[PDB]
Design a binder for these strands. Structure first.
Lengths: 93, 105, 97, 83, 97, 78, 105, 95
DNA sequence: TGTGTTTGGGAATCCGGTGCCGAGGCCGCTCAATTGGTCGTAGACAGCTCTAGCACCGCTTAAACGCACGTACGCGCTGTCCCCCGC
DNA sequence: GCGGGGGACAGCGCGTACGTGCGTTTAAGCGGTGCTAGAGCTGTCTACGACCAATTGAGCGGCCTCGGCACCGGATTCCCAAACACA
């Protein structure tokens, strides 16, 4: 049966950050768990926001508000910057 | 056909995140920019942690990252520590820390 | 002959274990304890090995954090020896029952 | 075989090692039993939930994923064992 | 006439644990909340029930914090609560790094 | 403006907590902690308001901001 | 025409709970017995709390229940206290409790 | 005039069953409404998780029972399960 | 130097009157629950494979245990000085 | 703002309990073998729940009443703080 992971994406990001460092299988398991956990946190918070504004779609705005709620100060600032950058680039092209 | 991740300049799978949002019953409908924004945020957090863990591994003359290095990276960065505060990491250990009272005079 | 003063080896052991990552409880007795506890909820229960491993990881993490808070409480009381009352206070403040 | 009085398998040196990892320099003699109590309680709380999650799935075997899910249900999430 | 020291402290402990009303003046707290919120977004308006909810939550939080602080002070074999007790209680609770 | 939380108010809050004797340095600590708490609640509440296109912080926003930290509050329309 | 609550011998609204389950995005499909079971559980829990709170109110020579009585009922019952441990009750107060150390000799 | 939803009347009926000569203030009714909504959301969320965990698409009485066992303390969970199973038994026995 | 008991005296509590406002009941209305019926499919059941959990055995050695021995830390006691408490 | 008294903090002694070390015992750990219960996957078919149109009564808004509770004053009682008699 097929299995789902973020292994290859995490490895690509690491190569983008530290181009000469490898990573264990156990550490890839932990990074996969962390990515999942954060994903569920953000998506659950966005769903909550949407249903408690009597609103039916999850838009980028819901994700941004969820990011401000979940992430600490400087991390939330930079994450919001990256998200806005990505949405702008995606819609421009 | 070029993938959504490429068009947004990301490395995380925008289409896959969109699929999980749809098949996760968070809402009946999902906007177009929501998966892009979420993938960008996830990629940024992963990049930050991998930065810090690689630095910690190089601090130990190690070229591979192990859960101990991830624990040191998380527990040494205060905003990451706040984010992953209630999280325990298998084979992680603890920070080297001895109270100044216990040290001999 | 030669004998170290009380507390020197304690610090040495503190540095060695705070530096290492290996599990500090023997695996077989912990597995037996887990099985005998679960025997009280359903008879004839099998366990994946990784399930017992996860349980041991979680228990050791919990106990290490608890011992950190106990040591803080003990130092707060101008003591160096941790005492059961320190454990009780730490769990009371933490919110456990 | 029946399993009985395995709480004594958590020996005094193992408890001392755990306390050392916690930065503790001196340990009282009554600590060891108290610890074996605390641990036994923690385990009962975790196992009861894991077993519940296994009963609901109709399985006779407790998987590691049930333990992870019980842990995160207690707000004590664990990384490194899937999920 | 005078009462013996600490006696009135106990009387007020009983008096305030018997009752349920808010122990913070409503208008200073309202001014403080508005002042704090000015740093996040400017020119906000608050329903009265919003400020009531904030006041209730803050008072409950502070009472719980003082309970933990009292536990810490008793543990050190004192009767007077000191800032070190607050810091230890908050650190164990997981609020203070 | 944090000074609106007077010495007797903190004394009363401690009394409800069962505290018999209070040191003189408690107050500036208590003010600090309380202020931090309020900032952590109000931030989230305001975030909910700004997300809702509104300009008025409602008691419901505060209730969700409290439930955010696991400080569930009963009695305000939750 | 007899209501679903009546047919199950309950007083809580089975139909309303079913509607909330459907319109709450908990799952795509909802079984027939799920709202009945859930309504029974809520009714039982409410009955427990109203028992304990009525007793507490009668302990104060009061024939009406006020938030103080509900707070005392919850904090005095250990399984309810475990259930509602992280919950604060508006206008609730606290349990009368003084440490035995603080009392004079 | 909007539409408001609450459990005031049902809570009042349960109260009349339990303590017939006893009333409830409006503040206490608001608290009980909050409690009922809170518990409903806890149980429903745990049941939704259980339904998803098993790769399952429907919320049945089994999921509600398991969620009740998970959330409530032991004795309370036991009585709650007894009451719920009795209610579903009566509901399906009649028709 | 010490302490069992005294006793006027503030402080919390009880009791009766009273008044007032919200809780409980009643009515008119409406919209959401109920009935009956169609239809699609989720899952319950059977049945089949293969893995991974359990039980056992033997051997080595590292860890646990018991014990001797010493010292250093906890705890009790005394003193003082000052900083919270009561008003 | 002020008087003062109790508690926090400093210093000392002592005694036993905890740390260090040594030798013996035990069972953990590792490997290796074998068995089978049960987890995981697949095909069917069927009952069960979603959807929809029509019916209607249960519940919600709005009004109205009175009794339960808040409040006030007056009397009851209950802890209190040293002072005294007496050891």
């Amino acid at each position: 049966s097929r299995k789902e992971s973020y292994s290859i994406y995490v490895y690509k990001v690491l190569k983008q950050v530290h181009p000469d460092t490898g990573i264990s299988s156990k550490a890839m398991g932990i990074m996969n768990s962390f990515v999942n956990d954060i994903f569920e946190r953000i998506a659950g918070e966005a769903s909550r926001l949407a249903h408690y504004n009597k609103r039916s779609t999850i838009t980028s705005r819901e994700i941004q508000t969820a990011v401000r709620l979940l992430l600490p100060g400087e991390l939330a600032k930079h994450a919001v910057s990256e998200g806005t950058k990505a949405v702008t680039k995606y819609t421009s092209a | 056909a070029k993938t959504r991740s490429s068009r947004a300049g990301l490395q995380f799978p925008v289409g896959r995140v969109h699929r999980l949002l749809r098949k996760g019953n968070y809402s009946e409908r999902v906007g177009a920019g929501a998966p892009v924004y979420l993938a960008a945020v996830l990629e940024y957090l992963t990049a930050e942690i991998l930065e810090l863990a690689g630095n910690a591994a190089r601090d130990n003359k190690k070229t591979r990252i192990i859960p101990r290095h991830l624990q040191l990276a998380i527990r040494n960065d205060e905003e990451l520590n706040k984010l992953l505060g209630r999280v325990t990491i298998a084979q992680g250990g603890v920070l080297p820390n001895i109270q100044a009272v216990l040290l001999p005079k | 002959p030669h004998r170290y003063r009380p507390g020197t080896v304690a610090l040495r052991e503190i540095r060695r274990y705070q530096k290492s990552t290996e599990l500090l409880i023997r695996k077989l007795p912990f597995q037996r304890l887990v099985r005998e506890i679960a025997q009280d909820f359903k008879t004839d229960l099998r366990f994946q090995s990784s399930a017992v491993m996860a349980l041991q990881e979680a228990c050791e993490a919990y106990l290490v954090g608890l011992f950190e808070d106990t040591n803080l409480c003990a130092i707060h009381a101008k003591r160096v020896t941790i005492m059961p009352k320190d454990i009780q206070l730490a769990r009371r403040i933490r919110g456990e029952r | 075989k029946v399993l009985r009085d395995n709480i004594q398998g958590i020996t005094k040196p193992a408890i001392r090692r755990l306390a050392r990892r916690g930065g503790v320099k001196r340990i009282s003699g009554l600590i060891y039993e108290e610890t074996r109590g605390v641990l036994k309680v923690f385990l009962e709380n975790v196992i009861r939930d894991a077993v519940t999650y296994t009963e609901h799935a109709k399985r006779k075997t407790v998987t590691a994923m049930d333990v992870v899910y019980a842990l995160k249900r207690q707000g004590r999430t664990l990384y490194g064992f899937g999920g």
